[PDB]
Design a protein around this ligand. Structure first.
Ligand SMILES: C=C[C@]1(C)C[C@@H](OC(=O)CS[C@H]2C[C@H]3CC[C@@H](C2)N3C)[C@]2(C)[C@H](C)CC[C@]3(CCC(=O)[C@H]32)[C@@H](C)[C@@H]1O
Ligand SMILES: [K+]
Ligand SMILES: [K+]
Ligand SMILES: [K+]
Ligand SMILES: [K+]
Ligand SMILES: [K+]
Ligand SMILES: [K+]
Ligand SMILES: [K+]
Ligand SMILES: [K+]
Ligand SMILES: [K+]
Ligand SMILES: [K+]
Ligand SMILES: [K+]
Ligand SMILES: [K+]
Ligand SMILES: [K+]
Ligand SMILES: [K+]
Ligand SMILES: [K+]
Ligand SMILES: [K+]
Ligand SMILES: [K+]
Ligand SMILES: [K+]
Ligand SMILES: [K+]
Ligand SMILES: [K+]
Ligand SMILES: [K+]
Ligand SMILES: [K+]
Ligand SMILES: [K+]
Ligand SMILES: [Mg+2]
Ligand SMILES: [Mg+2]
Ligand SMILES: [Mg+2]
Ligand SMILES: [Mg+2]
Ligand SMILES: [Mg+2]
Ligand SMILES: [Mg+2]
Ligand SMILES: [Mg+2]
Ligand SMILES: [Mg+2]
Ligand SMILES: [Mg+2]
Ligand SMILES: [Mg+2]
Ligand SMILES: [Mg+2]
Ligand SMILES: [Mg+2]
Ligand SMILES: [Mg+2]
Ligand SMILES: [Mg+2]
Ligand SMILES: [Mg+2]
Ligand SMILES: [Mg+2]
Ligand SMILES: [Mg+2]
Ligand SMILES: [Mg+2]
Ligand SMILES: [Mg+2]
Ligand SMILES: [Mg+2]
Ligand SMILES: [Mg+2]
Ligand SMILES: [Mg+2]
Ligand SMILES: [Mg+2]
Ligand SMILES: [Mg+2]
Ligand SMILES: [Mg+2]
Ligand SMILES: [Mg+2]
Ligand SMILES: [Mg+2]
Ligand SMILES: [Mg+2]
Ligand SMILES: [Mg+2]
Ligand SMILES: [Mg+2]
Ligand SMILES: [Mg+2]
Ligand SMILES: [Mg+2]
Ligand SMILES: [Mg+2]
Ligand SMILES: [Mg+2]
Ligand SMILES: [Mg+2]
Ligand SMILES: [Mg+2]
Ligand SMILES: [Mg+2]
Ligand SMILES: [Mg+2]
Ligand SMILES: [Mg+2]
Ligand SMILES: [Mg+2]
Ligand SMILES: [Mg+2]
Ligand SMILES: [Mg+2]
Ligand SMILES: [Mg+2]
Ligand SMILES: [Mg+2]
Ligand SMILES: [Mg+2]
Ligand SMILES: [Mg+2]
Ligand SMILES: [Mg+2]
Ligand SMILES: [Mg+2]
Ligand SMILES: [Mg+2]
Ligand SMILES: [Mg+2]
Ligand SMILES: [Mg+2]
Ligand SMILES: [Mg+2]
Ligand SMILES: [Mg+2]
Ligand SMILES: [Mg+2]
Ligand SMILES: [Mg+2]
Ligand SMILES: [Mg+2]
Ligand SMILES: [Mg+2]
Ligand SMILES: [Mg+2]
Ligand SMILES: [Mg+2]
Ligand SMILES: [Mg+2]
Ligand SMILES: [Mg+2]
Lengths: 77, 57
RNA sequence: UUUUGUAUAAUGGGUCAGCGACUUAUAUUCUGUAGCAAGGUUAACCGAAUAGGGGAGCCGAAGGGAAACCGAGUCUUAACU
RNA sequence: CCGACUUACCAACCCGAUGCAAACUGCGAAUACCGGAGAAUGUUAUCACGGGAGACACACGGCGGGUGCUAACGUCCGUCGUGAAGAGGGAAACAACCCAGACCGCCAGCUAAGGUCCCAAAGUCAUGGUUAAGUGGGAAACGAUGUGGGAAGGCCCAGACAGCGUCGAGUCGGCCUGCGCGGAAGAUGUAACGGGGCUAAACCAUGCACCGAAGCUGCGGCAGCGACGCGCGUUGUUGGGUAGGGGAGCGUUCUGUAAGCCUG
RNA sequence: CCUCCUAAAGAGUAACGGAGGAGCACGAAGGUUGGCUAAUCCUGGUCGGACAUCAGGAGGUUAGUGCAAUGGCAUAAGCCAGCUUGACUGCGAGCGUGACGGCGCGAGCAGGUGCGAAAGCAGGUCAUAGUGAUCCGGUGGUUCUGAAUGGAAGGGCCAUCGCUCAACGGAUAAAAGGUACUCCGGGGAUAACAGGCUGAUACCGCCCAAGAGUUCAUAUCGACGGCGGUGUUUGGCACCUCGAUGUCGGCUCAUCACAUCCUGGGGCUGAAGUAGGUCCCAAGGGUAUGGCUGUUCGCCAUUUAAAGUGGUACGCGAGCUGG
RNA sequence: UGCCUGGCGGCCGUAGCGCGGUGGUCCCACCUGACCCCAUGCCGAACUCAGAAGUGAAACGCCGUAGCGCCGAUGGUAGUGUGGGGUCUCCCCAUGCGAGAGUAGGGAACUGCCAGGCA
C-alpha cells in the first residue's frame, strides 16, 4: 500500500574543490567536509564547518604527516 | 621519422574520445591517409584508436 | 497529421474548380540601412502648399544615493586598507 | 546454615579454523574527474555578451544498478550508441542491432558488415578434422555400451575378459574433453534453415580468391566555408536532416516609370 | 528540511526504492585560560545484591558528543574549574553552491571588548536539520521626505515584530459536496473488453527417492527438494484501438489442437476370469435430455459406448436473442 | 673524534609491544621536607615551592632476544579501460592497467640542532 521511507536531504556538494598542484588565490576553498577528514597545514585555515581554505596565494599540497598519518592540506606560497 | 596513418573503419558509433582522437590525428574519412611525426604523443593517439587505423611504418 | 514509433487495422480527405489561416494599429527593444551628429528630431497646429513654418516636447551628451544631497564621482560607515 | 557428586544437557568470553554484507573496512584497482606542461592536429572546435528560437511525452540497444520474478517490447536512475531528426548495404520480412553518414550525374573501379549449390551477385574453392542427429535449422534438470580426441590406471601368454579346468588376446571402468542422442505436447496450412534443396550446400581449423553499400576511388558538374594570391583564379575542406535559426530567390494582383512600349 | 545507502572511488543523479531524524535546545551547553581523560572487566572491600561508592590492576576509547545518521574529535571537538559577554558593530580580498530568489565558507581592515604572563584565541555552540519570499501592517530610532509656507500626517531609511502561508517558491483576508438528468474540449499520453509482451500464479510433464504398498521405493502412490513445457487460469505491464475494436449467457453454424471421454492397437499390473489400475500409440468417426438458476458452471433426475479437454476477438449480435 | 645523558625537531610501527639483561660521576628519576609561593570539589597524589641524606626499586635510557605487532617481494589469481566474441542471469579472446589476501623474506628503527658528563 504505502511505505514509511521516501525521504532524503539535499546533496551538500562536499569534497575537494582544488586538487594537488592547483594555483589558488587566498580565501579559495580547497575542501568542504564534515569534520577534519583533511587537516589544515601551512597557509590553510579551517572554517567553522571544517572547510579548509587558502590563507595565501600558492599551490595546493596534500601531505600525510605526524604520528596518526593524518592528511594535511597546505599552500606552497 | 614520420608515420603514415590510414583510417580503416567508420567513426560512426564510436566513443566521443575516439572521435576526438581521429580529429587529433586529422583523419577525416575511411581510407584517408595522413603523414604525422613519430612522437610518443602521436603513438598514444594511434594506440587509442588502433582498432580503426593502420600505421605504415 | 500525430507520435518513442505508423503500410498501419490511428486521424483526415469521394473528385474537381473557386475561396480558406501569422494581419492591422500603436508603443517598445534589437538588427540592417540612410540623414545629421554632441547633438538628433519635431507633435498638435499654421500653411492650397508631401514645401516652408512650428523645438511645446522627446531622446542623448553623468553618475551615485531610498532621499536631502553630492557630482567624475557617489553611496556605504564614526572612518575606510 | 550449608555443601558435594552430577548431567540427552543449554552455554558467554577467549583461542584456532570457514564463509557472508547496499546502509561493514586495520586494504584497494581499472576507469573517470581536477590541475600543470609539451607536440601534432582540428574551418575557434572555447568563453563572454547580444537578436531569434525550439524543447522540457522520449524509444531501443550496450554497460553499471534500484524496482519487479537478474519476468515483461515492464519500470526508475547513471553512462555511451543509434532511432527520434538518417537514406544506403546486412540481419527473409524487421525505427532503435551490425556495416555505413545520401551535394548532383556515370551502363567505371575497390571494399564494409554480410556472403559465394539454385531462387540470387560471388568458391559445388583448397587442405585437415568432426557430426549421421536434416544435428545444423527451438527447449533444462537428468538419462544412455552413440561417436571422436587426450592423459592415467587395474588385470593379462605364472593364460586375463566373456562363454562353456578349458580358451589363446587383450580386457575392465573411472578421468578430462569435441560433436551428436533421448528428455521435446497446441490449436487455419508445411510453418522452429526465408524457400528449393543439402550429408555438405553442416560444424571446426587454416588459407587464398571473388561478390557485396548512396562507404572509398575514378571522371564530369554545382554550391557553402576558409586560406593563399591577384569579383575573378589556385588550393584546402564541407554540403543527411524534424523542431527551429540564418541566407537568397520565383511567381501572382495592384501603383509609378507609362499619353511610353506590345497588340485586330 | 537533515543523515546514511542506492550513487557506477570528483560533483550531481530517479522510483509510491531501503533505513532513520528535524520544525529545537543552551547566558551556558557561548568566549577564553588552566587543568583532566573513557567503556568494560578481573582481584579485594560495612550494609551492598549482577549492577552504587572505595582501592589496585587489566584494558586503551570497544567511551563521550544536549537530540538522527554520517564524517570528525586526545593539541581533544569529550570531562572539570576560574574569569567573562566576540552569541560584538561597521566592512570584507577571495572562494563554494545555486536557473533565479538565495544559501554557505572566509583571512584581513576599522572601532570597541573578554580571557591569557605572553604567543594568541574569540563575529556563538564538533559539523551537517531546528525553517517561510513578497505584500500588508505594528513598535523603536532617524527632521531623509514633508503637495502655498512653518509644522504635522503619511512615506523613506535603520533596527525589530506578526504566517503548521506544513500543498512548506507561499493562487484569496475569506470556500465543502452530488450528478445514473447530465454537458463540452481532449487522450489510446490513461483504466474497463479483446489482442500483445511476460509467465509470478495456473495447468501439464519430468528428476531425486524418504516412505506407503504383508515382504518389496518405482503394480499403484510419491514426503523433502530439483528441472522444464504450455499460453491455459489469476495476475503484471500499458504496446494497438477512446474522430467507438458491441460486451455475459443462450440460439444458429462451426473449425482446429491433442494433454484421448468413447470406439481401435499395445506394455506393465499388487492382470485367474470378469472387470479394473497405470503408461504408450492413435484425432477416423462419435461424444445426453431434463429440473433449478440470466447463468457459464454446479447440484439433482434419468440416459449413453462415451456424455473429452482446450484454441478460434473467453469462435460466432453488418447471423438471431436480450434473461 | 668516540661513549653517556638531557632538551627540541625530522620521521610516524622495518620505528610499536613482550621478554632477558643493564646504568647512577654527570644527567634523569624517584627521593627529602613544606611557616613559605602556589595547590587538593578530601589528600603536598598531582600541581608548587625549599632542598640533596638515600636508591636505581619503580620509571626512564641503553643493550640483547622473533613470541607478537609491523613491513614485504616474485609469480599467480581477482577486478578493469578499449576493441572483439559466446552457450549472454554470466563469461571468453586481443591489448593496456593490475590488486587484496597469502608466500619467500625483512625486521629489535634511523636521523638533525643545541647543551652537559666522561674518555
Ligand atoms: C460504447 C462502447 C462499445 C459499444 C462497448 C464497450 O463497452 C464499454 O465501453 C463498457 S461502458 C458502456 C458502453 C455503452 C455506451 C454507454 C454505456 C456504458 N453502454 C451502453 C466494449 C464492450 C469494451 C469494454 C471497450 C471496447 C469496445 C469495442 C470492443 C468491445 O468489446 C467494446 C467499444 C469501443 C464499443 O464500441
Ligand atoms: K576554490
Ligand atoms: K497516440
Ligand atoms: K479509431
Ligand atoms: K520594431
Ligand atoms: K536605425
Ligand atoms: K568607490
Ligand atoms: K541505458
Ligand atoms: K545520427
Ligand atoms: K533441420
Ligand atoms: K565556557
Ligand atoms: K578586532
Ligand atoms: K504548493
Ligand atoms: K460542483
Ligand atoms: K516433461
Ligand atoms: K516390489
Ligand atoms: K477505446
Ligand atoms: K470447439
Ligand atoms: K492396459
Ligand atoms: K479422433
Ligand atoms: K472481443
Ligand atoms: K450475444
Ligand atoms: K463486423
Ligand atoms: K441482421
Ligand atoms: Mg546526503
Ligand atoms: Mg597526525
Ligand atoms: Mg501511442
Ligand atoms: Mg514502416
Ligand atoms: Mg497496427
Ligand atoms: Mg489509415
Ligand atoms: Mg486496409
Ligand atoms: Mg484524433
Ligand atoms: Mg474519412
Ligand atoms: Mg542623475
Ligand atoms: Mg513538463
Ligand atoms: Mg518529462
Ligand atoms: Mg529517460
Ligand atoms: Mg540493465
Ligand atoms: Mg520501456
Ligand atoms: Mg528489460
Ligand atoms: Mg517528435
Ligand atoms: Mg537506417
Ligand atoms: Mg535497412
Ligand atoms: Mg532487405
Ligand atoms: Mg572485389
Ligand atoms: Mg549466382
Ligand atoms: Mg569442395
Ligand atoms: Mg532442427
Ligand atoms: Mg539436447
Ligand atoms: Mg498442423
Ligand atoms: Mg556502388
Ligand atoms: Mg560519397
Ligand atoms: Mg554527406
Ligand atoms: Mg542540409
Ligand atoms: Mg502598372
Ligand atoms: Mg559521488
Ligand atoms: Mg563516479
Ligand atoms: Mg541527469
Ligand atoms: Mg568548549
Ligand atoms: Mg558545546
Ligand atoms: Mg551539534
Ligand atoms: Mg494591500
Ligand atoms: Mg507644507
Ligand atoms: Mg497643503
Ligand atoms: Mg511548492
Ligand atoms: Mg465528449
Ligand atoms: Mg498506450
Ligand atoms: Mg487487457
Ligand atoms: Mg492477459
Ligand atoms: Mg512507458
Ligand atoms: Mg488491438
Ligand atoms: Mg475511424
Ligand atoms: Mg498422444
Ligand atoms: Mg488428420
Ligand atoms: Mg482410412
Ligand atoms: Mg444442464
Ligand atoms: Mg466471444
Ligand atoms: Mg469454444
Ligand atoms: Mg440485428
Ligand atoms: Mg459479427
Ligand atoms: Mg435486461
Ligand atoms: Mg615531590
Ligand atoms: Mg630498575
Ligand atoms: Mg600485494
Ligand atoms: Mg624493545
Amino acid at each position: 500500500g504505502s511505505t514509511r521511507n521516501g525521504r532524503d536531504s539535499e546533496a551538500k556538494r562536499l569534497g575537494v574543490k582544488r586538487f594537488g598542484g592547483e594555483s589558488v588565490l587566498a580565501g579559495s576553498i580547497i575542501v568542504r567536509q564534515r569534520g577534519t577528514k583533511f587537516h589544515a597545514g601551512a597557509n590553510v585555515g579551517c572554517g567553522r564547518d571544517h572547510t579548509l581554505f587558502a590563507k595565501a596565494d600558492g599551490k595546493v599540497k596534500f601531505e600525510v604527516k605526524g604520528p596518526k598519518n593524518r592528511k594535511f592540506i597546505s599552500i606552497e606560497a | 621519422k614520420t608515420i603514415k596513418i590510414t583510417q580503416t573503419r567508420s567513426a560512426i558509433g564510436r566513443l566521443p574520445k575516439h572521435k576526438a582522437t581521429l580529429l587529433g590525428l586529422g583523419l577525416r574519412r575511411i581510407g584517408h591517409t595522413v603523414e604525422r611525426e613519430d612522437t610518443p604523443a602521436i603513438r598514444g593517439m594511434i594506440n587509442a584508436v588502433s582498432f580503426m587505423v593502420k600505421v605504415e611504418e
